[PDB]
């Protein structure tokens, strides 16, 4: 009597994990690779703390006198119920970190799958209604919400056929079209994606970095082009350049160079 609650709880904890660069003041382990896609197993060992009886992948501060941020309890298991946790598909982009050479990627998109082990495949629509209601109860917009059939891919899985939640519920023609292709080589599953797509605001702690080749500008009465600056990189010279040549004069007080 907690499957609808548990699907959103784990999905939101998976989304929180996806948005953090450091966990317990240490680098996020999922950012420490260079692959464009990685599948994290359904066992959720990767989401449990390292300071657990069985070692997880989440780093600790080291001194356990501080409260260690965690995402799921150590004995937690979500391979239960009509909607059974199946794993999460992470998609990455290459990334530039100022201080961690093992950090080579940042997270592009996370989709967490819940296979339906209900009595009738047709009943996945009801299980979907309870989760979406619990998600909207907790303020989460489910991006591209869909019932899917997934097959193994080179990295993790890929969606052979997908149908919007609206079409599974309001078009019996489309619904039986989908339930038809659900065969033994595919797994019937719910695809839960959270939110946050828009552009990002620069923060007062400086944790947010400018994007590559972006220009910081001032409104000037000079019009355009004469008020901006950027940090450029020379792919051959292997030198970072602080381009102020758009400014006519740079007036400082004290000044030192090397």
């Amino acid at each position: 009597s907690s499957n609808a609650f548990d699907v959103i709880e784990l999905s939101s904890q998976i989304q929180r994990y996806a948005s953090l660069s450091k966990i317990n003041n240490r680098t996020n382990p999922i950012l420490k690779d260079n692959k464009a896609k990685e599948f994290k197993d359904a066992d959720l060992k990767w989401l449990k703390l390292e300071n657990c009886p069985t070692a997880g992948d989440v780093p600790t501060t080291g001194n356990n006198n501080d409260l260690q941020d965690q995402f799921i309890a150590c004995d937690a298991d979500y391979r239960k119920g009509d909607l059974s946790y199946f794993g999460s598909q992470f998609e990455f982009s290459t990334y530039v970190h100022p201080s961690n050479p093992e950090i080579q990627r940042q997270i592009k998109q996370v989709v967490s799958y819940f296979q339906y082990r209900g009595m009738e495949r047709a009943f996945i629509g009801d299980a979907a209604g309870y989760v979406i209601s619990e998600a909207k109860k907790k303020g989460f917009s489910a991006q591209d919400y869909r019932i899917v059939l997934i097959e193994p891919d080179r990295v993790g899985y890929f969606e052979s056929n997908a149908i919007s939640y609206e079409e599974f519920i309001e078009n019996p023609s489309a619904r039986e079209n989908f339930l038809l292709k659900a065969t033994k080589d595919r797994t019937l599953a719910l695809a839960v994606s959270l939110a946050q797509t828009g552009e990002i605001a620069m923060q007062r702690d400086g944790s947010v970095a400018f994007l590559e080749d972006s220009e910081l500008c001032w409104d000037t009465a000079a019009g355009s082009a004469k008020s901006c600056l950027s940090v450029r990189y020379d792919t051959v010279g292997n030198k970072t350049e602080l381009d102020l040549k758009q400014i006519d004069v740079v007036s400082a007080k004290g000044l030192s160079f090397e």
Binding site: D234, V236, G237, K239
Partner: protein, 66 residues
């Protein structure tokens, strides 16, 4: 400076080594797209030839002409 890109000029105090052998100075590392420039200008001198020690900025030892 007048359309040309420049680095700040940096300065060294130099004397020749004993023996009348040529003076070697390492060129500064120039940023990509700039070329090395050099200029030597006279500070102190005499006609002592080899009978001198001018390596001190604060005084000049000049023992005369051979």
């Amino acid at each position: 400076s007048d359309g040309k890109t420049k680095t700040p000029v940096v300065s060294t105090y130099e004397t020749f080594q004993d023996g009348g052998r040529a003076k070697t100075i390492n060129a500064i590392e120039c940023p990509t797209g700039l070329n090395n420039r050099f200029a030597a200008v006279v500070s102190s001198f005499s006609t002592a030839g080899q009978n001198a020690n001018f390596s001190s900025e604060s005084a000049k030892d000049s023992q005369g002409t051979t």
